[PDB]
Each structure stands twice: as C-alpha cells, then as structure tokens.
Design a protein around this nucleic acid. Sequence first.
RNA 1: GAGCUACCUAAAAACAAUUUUAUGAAUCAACUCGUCUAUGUGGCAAAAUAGUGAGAAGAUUUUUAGGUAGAGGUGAAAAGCCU
Lengths: 49, 308, 115, 153, 217, 108
Amino acid sequence: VARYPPIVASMTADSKAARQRRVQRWQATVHAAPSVDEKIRILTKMQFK
Amino acid sequence: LHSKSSTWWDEHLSEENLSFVKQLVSDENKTQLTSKLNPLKDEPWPLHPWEPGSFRVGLIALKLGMMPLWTKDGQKHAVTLLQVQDCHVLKYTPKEDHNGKIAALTVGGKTVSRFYKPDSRLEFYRDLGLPPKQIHKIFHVTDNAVIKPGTPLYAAHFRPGQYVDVTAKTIGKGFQGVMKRWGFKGQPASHGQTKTHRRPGAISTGDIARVWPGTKMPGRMGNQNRTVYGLKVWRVNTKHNIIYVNGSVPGHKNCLVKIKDSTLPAYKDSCKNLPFPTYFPDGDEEELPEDLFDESVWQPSEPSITFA
Amino acid sequence: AVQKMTRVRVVDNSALGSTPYHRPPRCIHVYNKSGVGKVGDQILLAIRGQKKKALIVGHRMPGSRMTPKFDSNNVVLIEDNGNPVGTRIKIPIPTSLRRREGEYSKVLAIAQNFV
Amino acid sequence: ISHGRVYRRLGLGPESRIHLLRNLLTGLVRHERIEATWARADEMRGYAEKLIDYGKLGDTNERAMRMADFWLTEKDLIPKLFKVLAPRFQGQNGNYTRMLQIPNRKEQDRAKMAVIEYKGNYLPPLPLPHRDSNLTLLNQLLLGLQQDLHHNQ
Amino acid sequence: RFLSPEFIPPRGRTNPLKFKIERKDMLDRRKVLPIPEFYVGSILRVTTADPYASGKTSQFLGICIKRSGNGLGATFTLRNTIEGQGVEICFELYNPRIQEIQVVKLEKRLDDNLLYLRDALPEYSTFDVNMKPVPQEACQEVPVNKLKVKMKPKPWSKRWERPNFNIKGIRFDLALTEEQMKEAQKWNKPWIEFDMMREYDTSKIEAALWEEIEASK
Amino acid sequence: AAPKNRRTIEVNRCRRRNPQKLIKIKNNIDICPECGHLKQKHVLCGYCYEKVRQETTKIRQQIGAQEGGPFRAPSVETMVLYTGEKPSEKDQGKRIVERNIKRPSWFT
RNA sequence: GAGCUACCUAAAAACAAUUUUAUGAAUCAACUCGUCUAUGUGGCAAAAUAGUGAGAAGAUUUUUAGGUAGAGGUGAAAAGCCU
Ligand SMILES: [Mg+2]
Ligand SMILES: [Mg+2]
Ligand SMILES: [Mg+2]
Ligand SMILES: [Mg+2]
Ligand SMILES: [Mg+2]
Ligand SMILES: [Mg+2]
Ligand SMILES: [Mg+2]
Ligand SMILES: [Mg+2]
Ligand SMILES: [Mg+2]
Ligand SMILES: [Mg+2]
Ligand SMILES: [Mg+2]
Ligand SMILES: [Mg+2]
Ligand SMILES: [Mg+2]
Ligand SMILES: [Mg+2]
Ligand SMILES: [Mg+2]
Ligand SMILES: [Mg+2]
Ligand SMILES: [Zn+2]
C-alpha cells in the first residue's frame, strides 16, 4: 500500500505538459461556475487578435 | 616523450600488488617498532645522576581534545588531553657543533606513511631504523641528561604535579582585517560614516612622510608558533600515554605539540623528583598504575565531595 | 549585567524604594573597575530625585554553573554607613554573597530566604 | 573561516543550491549517467547515494516515500527508484555512484567536467582506468617476492 | 533502552579515543551515584553540597527545561518559581558535590525545549517545593504531557512564533492573530527538512555504545 | 589615484615576464593505450569517451521513440540488444532496446 | 527656435475600494509629485536606483493640434523658465 504521488505534470513548470495542466485548471473554474453568465464571462474575459 | 615524467607509488602497482604493498609496509613498521622497544637492553649510554642545573628532554604529543576535571575543593578545571604517539629521539648533536652552550636532541613523533615523503627523509629514517615521524623538534638538554638516539619515549616521562609548557602552531584564520587581527575599535555604522566601518585609521604621522616599520596592518592571522607556560599536569594515563594539562593548549584538535619541562623561575628545580633521563618501562624497575593522579584531584568512583 | 541607565527592581521593604510608584530606579554608577556589575557589586541608584547606594543581589545574565539566574534584576538599598535601608528581604537571596570579598553579612541576616 | 563547512555555495542562495541539485539528481535517477561541472557533480554525489538508502528502507516506510517526492521532481521516477534501483543495491552497502573527470569543456568556458553514473547501468561501460597486469616487469618482480614471503610465512 | 544523551558523541574530526576515556570516567561515577532517567519537562529534585556552608547540603526543585553538553560536561537546567521570583540553575550531571538526583515526575513534553516558559504565565512554571514523588511504571512508554501553555503580552524574550524555533507547545491562537502567523512563515526555510546531508545517523553508534555501557553494568 | 609617471618598457618587461606570470609546463600527459590519442593521467580520454557517449545518444534516442511520452519511464529493468542476439531466460521481463548495428567491442 | 519648458486657446481622456457626507474633507492604489537616508559618482542615469515619504473629484493629472520670440516672450517672483 504505497501512496505514490499522481504521475502528472507540474503546474508551474515551463513545459508543454505543465502548460496543458494549467489550461485544465482554468477550464475547471468554468465547469464549477454556478451560473451561465459567469460561465460566459470567464470564457471571454481575455481578448486576443 | 623525451622529457621529465611525473609518477607516484600507485601508478604502476597492479591490483594484487596494491594490497600486498599496502600490507608489506604495515608489517615492516611493527617489526621496526618492536626492535627499539627495549632501550636499556640495547647498549644504553651511561645514566649519570641528577645535579642542580639539569634540563631534561621533552615529548611531542597529539592534542586529542578537552574535557572537564574537578578537584577535592569542588572547583572544575578545564583540562586538555595530550597523547604521546611513537615519540622516539632521532639525533643527538654535541655542545660545540649545536652552536649553543647546551647540547640538543631531536624528538620526533606521530608515525606517518612512507609513500609521500622525499627520498632524503626516508634514507635518514632507514639508517635510524625507525618509521618516519610527522614532525621534528629540538630540545636543549644538558650533557648529563643525554639519551641515546632511537630511545622510545612515553608519557611516563612526566608525573602528576609537575608544571609543564606546551608550544604549537596556532589555528590559521587567514587574511583578516585590522579590527579582528589587532582588536581595532573601528568606525560607527551610522550617522554618516560612508564606506568606513572596519578600516584602519590614520597609518602614521604626516610629517615623517612614511609608515613606521612593524605597523599593525591587515594580514594573515594564526598559523604561528606560540607557547603556553606554567600548565600543571593533573593526571597521567600510562596505558594510553595521555597527559592531562591544565587550561588551553595552542593549535587545533589533533595538532602535534611540543611538551617540555617548564622554564618559569618557580619551576626551576622540579625535575629532580621525576625520572632524570626518562622512564624506561622495559627496565621494569617498578610497575606503575594505569592512572596517576594528583593529591588535590578528586578521582572518579570516590565518595561524593562534602564541604564539611 | 547591570550598567548605567539600567532600570532595576528594589527587592526590599524600604518605604522610599519599595513603594510601587514612579519610574523604575535607574543605575547611575557602578563601583567596579569594569562597568558591568554582577551579584554582590555595589551600584549608585537614582530614586525620586535622590542618589542612593544599593547592592545587587541578582541579575538576569547567565552565570557560572550551579548558580541562580533570576528573571529580573534585583537590588537592595544600602545606607552609606553600610546598614541596609530595608528591614526585611523576603525574596530569595543567593548565598554566594557570604564568600564574596566584601561586607554582606548584614544583608544575609535581613534576608530570611536563601537560594 | 569556512573550516568544517562541508557544503558549497551554489546558485542564488541556500534554497537555490537545493533546487539545482534536485535537477541533476532527477536527471541521474532518470538517465543513470549525467554530466555536470566537477564541483556541482561532486556536490550531488552525497545526495545521490542517500536516495538509495531511503529506497532500501522500502515503499511502506512513510519517511522514505515523503523524501523520495521532494528529491524527484518528475513523479514517474519514484516507482523506478524503489523497484529497480533499490533492489540492485541491496547487496551493496555503499559505492552506489561512480564519478570520473571528463576533459575540460570545449565551449570557450573551459570548465572542469565530471561524469557521474549509477553502477550496473545498461549504458555502454565508461572508459575506466586500467592498472597494469601482473605480468609487467615491476608487477612480476613483486609477485616473486610475495611467493618467497608466503613460503617464509 | 534509554541511552543518556551525553553518551552519544557529536560528529566531527575528534578521535574516538577521547570519547572512550570520558565514558570510562563517567561510568565509574554512575556506580557511586545513580543518575535516574529523565526527559525535558520532568520535575526533578537535586541535592548538592554548598561550599559556603560547613557540612550542610541544599536541595532545589524545578522542571527540567533544557538538556545540553556531551560526555562528562553534560548539564541540565531545571526551573522553578519561589515567592513569585523565577529562578533557573544549570546543573552538571557529574559534579562531585551532587549527592542525589530524584525524578519527582517522569514525563515528556511536546517540545525538546521549554525555554518559552519564560514568556508563559507564572502558573505554568510554578511547582510545589515539597511535592511528593508520583508512582512510576517502568514497563510503559514515558507519559507525554501535551499541555499547551498560555503566553503573556506579545513582547517576548525570543520570537517563539518564528518557524526556526519550531515550538509545538504554545497556544499561538489566543496570543497571536492569524495575519501575524502568516508573516512569520516568510522565514520558514522549508528546504532544510529535506536535505539528506543534514542528518546524523547514530544507529550503529547507539548500538555500539549500549553494549559497552551495559557491559560495565 | 592616478599614475604620476609613465612606466618604462624595461619595468613593464620585468613585471609581465616574471616567472610567476608564465605558463607552467604539464608533466602528466600520456598516450591512450587503445586509440593512441593524448590524455592526462587523472582524466579520461576524450577520443575513447566520445565513442561511448555517441553510442549512448543513439541508445537513448531509440528509448525515446519506444516510450513516446514524458512520464513513461518503466520500473522494470532496462536492457539493450543488438542484431543477432536474442533475450535469455534470465532476461525475461526486461525492457529491450533494439539497435541495428552489431555489438560494439567495448560493449559487453 | 515654445515637439523641452512658462502661460494661454480649442478638441478630448483618466480617477478602484472604503468612510464621511454632500466636500480645493478622510484612509489608500492606479496616477502625479520628489521630504528624508543610503548607494552611485566616466554611474543603469550629463540627475538614476533601493527604501522612505506628499497629493490622489481637484487651483486634479494626461493626450492631440495651435498661439505668444530675445530692445522680446512667460512668470501662484525662484531674477524662475524659453531645446
Ligand atoms: Mg508560455
Ligand atoms: Mg562598533
Ligand atoms: Mg556603511
Ligand atoms: Mg579558514
Ligand atoms: Mg573545506
Ligand atoms: Mg553549542
Ligand atoms: Mg533580551
Ligand atoms: Mg504644443
Ligand atoms: Mg507656472
Ligand atoms: Mg474614486
Ligand atoms: Mg514638481
Ligand atoms: Mg497621506
Ligand atoms: Mg492630508
Ligand atoms: Mg482629496
Ligand atoms: Mg525674491
Ligand atoms: Mg539651451
Ligand atoms: Zn583513448
């Protein structure tokens, strides 16, 4: 019964896998967002070309 | 190529020889040490009696460390442990050639390896028939107290009670500033002192247009031969050749020292009671106890001190 | 280490100093070749616009082994002639004062306790 | 004034020194042969061996598991350390890592280098130094002496 | 097996021969005077002869707040408050003028040091002078008293809230606001607990010492 | 502080040609038994060492292709096999890295 | 030569949270400024950096274009500014 740490990429590392995990964190906030208007706000609050 | 090459003992030795060589040398050291274990049965020089004005030889010991000690008055005295290791007299110069009024003997200690020594040093020790010693020192000894070269020396040369003097190189602290080296006060940290906190003040007088020789300036501190005088001998451990010397002794732990009979005026004639040339256990005149104590010292396992 | 300007506790019963009012007495002079004053060392104390000689009976600085280190700097007021000002000293007083060079028997008689 | 201070001063401070060694160690625990400047490789060597000591303790031990996490940034290597590195070294009690000095770097930095590895690795064997054979002139003479002495003994 | 802390040598370049000599002297004294087992936080009564007095001894009772020293120089400090006056005395284990050492209450506390009691309320350091010894069970684990003391106003002799001390026996919440506690963590130094070269392993030494110590018996 | 006089080439030639400022010759250079290239006694031979590292890179590249991911390190023992070699019974259950080239002489 | 800077005209823009109230009031960011100490001193800098400080809905700050030119211009006057 060895409670190994999960085999996942680091959150704060400067790597593609680490970047992808940070992306999942952002998407989590949308999933747990209570209302639709808050869902839309989180998705589109940042403007890129 | 056709040029000078660098080499060491291990460069060529094979795997099997490597262990054999490191073992053969160890066997030889034991045999050589045993050969000199009996001074009095090896054509000893005449043992003249003591008379006033005599000066004995002294030992070279390794500084093991420090430990506390108590006297029957209840006071605690910090005492240091000095171990005599393979202390053998090496060379005997005569009065005239020594350039001093007194004769001089060389007393080496602390046997060391043979693989990293200059050929000249090994040749000298081979003739003497003893393993090489880490350090050499010279003791001024009167003609009456001369000891034949190669005579082993032990901690029984001293006894409890005798004041003794120890000298060794001080711990090297490297290049240091004027404040730490000589205890200069220095300058204040605040109130406007700009880039001047630990610097020396005015070097000298302006008019002389120069700095006096010997001025106290930043430089390397420590690693200088120094001596401590009037250090009582509290106890002598015959089995391990450990002498208990009062107070602090110069040098780092495991540093070789030069123990010698004290030169202070009060201790002028303290050698008379002790063995005049030295103590030879091989003589077996008397069997000494393992631990020798001084009268004031409170030995362990005795009843607890009561200040009645 | 009692020095100049140190606020000190007058562990005594003298009305002049034992009463709990005014700023804590401050040390003005230490009767030693060195500035630092330890147990059994006289000091000059300024109390209520007056200069009174006192005696140190304890201090907060660590001492030699088997010695009592107090949690406050304690001092005892002593008259110029040597007789202590206070008539009683209930807080424990270290017994080392007996063998220290000086006159301390008077204080020991006043001090009922001993540590 | 740094007598008895075993540690070096590396990185931007004490914590940085710990985090640079965690990266060489993780690379070593992952590749089993890593290169670095002699000073930094030698600094890690003490840390490299002590991981095997914790690995020997076993998975169940909580302290070994916790330590194996701080000192292994990548988390796919804790299973390896416990289940292949540790079993290999059970017989031995020391000398887990082999360190040798590679020539100076050809970078215009010209820094001293060393290669550190784990013994028994699958990678091609390092060009280790070779001592002379017993048949060589000097070696053969010593063997003759050994035989003579063995007979005398 | 309770090995007295002083027996374990500290690491360094000192030769073992120095420790061997000290142990032999220490063991000899233990035969004359038995040093009972005690840990920081236990209440002790120590009888010592007074050099100033003529054929008269003295006793001091207090809680052991610190254990320090190695070999024959081992010392321990036990504290108590008398007549509202706090007193601390540093005692040497092997001083020849100690007649007896008594463990009034054998117990362990959450912390390896109780120096912070200076900033605690007076009650937490006051102990009755004549308190009688409590019964003790050898075939048990030493009782661990988990009392968390209450502190006096914030200005303390030392910054006990700071992470370096690692005090686990103070009720910080009553005395310190949560914002202050977060500020203390700026000095945490988390890396120290996970560097494998700061650990001094004495498993073999402790086993080796125990045999020799038991061998003397 | 600024120079009070120009320093002559004779004085300059005394300072920069001092023995303390010259290159000290190296006495620890030897010839590698295998390849014959030069090496220092206390250092490995770069020419021989380069062969080992070049093979190491090829083996490591092959390993990377098989795993195909960052966190794919296998707990089980690793092993490298070259063409013409088949795993033994004792080598069962060990990751195998296949190399097209023949077994190098130094590799055993 | 008023793209710096003093002043003015025109067209514009910025000011979160908190408490007062209904404001050249308060705490304090963005932002404006430049009391103090320290470092720097051929400096990162021909006036900066690190801290510490003052104002921050107003006589506020900022942007864009234009106007006033040396016997002069501008000036909440320091004989201050006008590359
Ligand atoms: Mg990115
Ligand atoms: Mg100063
Ligand atoms: Mg300064
Ligand atoms: Mg040094
Ligand atoms: Mg060093
Ligand atoms: Mg200490
Ligand atoms: Mg303090
Ligand atoms: Mg304009
Ligand atoms: Mg204006
Ligand atoms: Mg607003
Ligand atoms: Mg301004
Ligand atoms: Mg303000
Ligand atoms: Mg205001
Ligand atoms: Mg306002
Ligand atoms: Mg004016
Ligand atoms: Mg101009
Ligand atoms: Zn080669």
